[PDB]
């Protein structure tokens, strides 16, 4: 966590429901957007910090 890893995501279609429907995730909280809505949106940049 002191050395946290960022992946850039671009030039693709993102079905976020493949993530937010998975019962594996012990936490899934969103800010400035609702996860229910992500299937219609589009974005300049996407990052995954891990």
């Amino acid at each position: 966590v002191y050395a946290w890893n960022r992946k850039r995501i671009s030039n693709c279609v993102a079905d976020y429901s493949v993530l937010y429907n998975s019962a594996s995730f012990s936490t899934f909280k969103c800010y400035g957007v609702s996860p229910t809505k992500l299937n219609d949106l589009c974005f300049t940049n996407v990052y995954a910090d891990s």
Binding site: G32, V33, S34, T36, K37, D40, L41
Partner: protein, 49 residues
């Protein structure tokens, strides 16, 4: 000489330019644009914005 008539046109133009530019102001919401809020949030979160 017609400065009296032109002043009335200028004041009415400034009144509408100010009224319309104020649609772009946030007033403390997440965004100035109403369709962006509705395309991003569900009712319980959106109604506060």
């Amino acid at each position: 000489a017609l400065g009296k008539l032109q002043d009335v046109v200028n004041q009415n133009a400034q009144a509408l330019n100010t009224l319309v530019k104020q649609l772009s102001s946030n007033f403390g919401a997440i965004s100035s644009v109403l369709n962006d809020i509705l395309a991003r949030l569900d009712k319980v979160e959106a109604e506060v914005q």
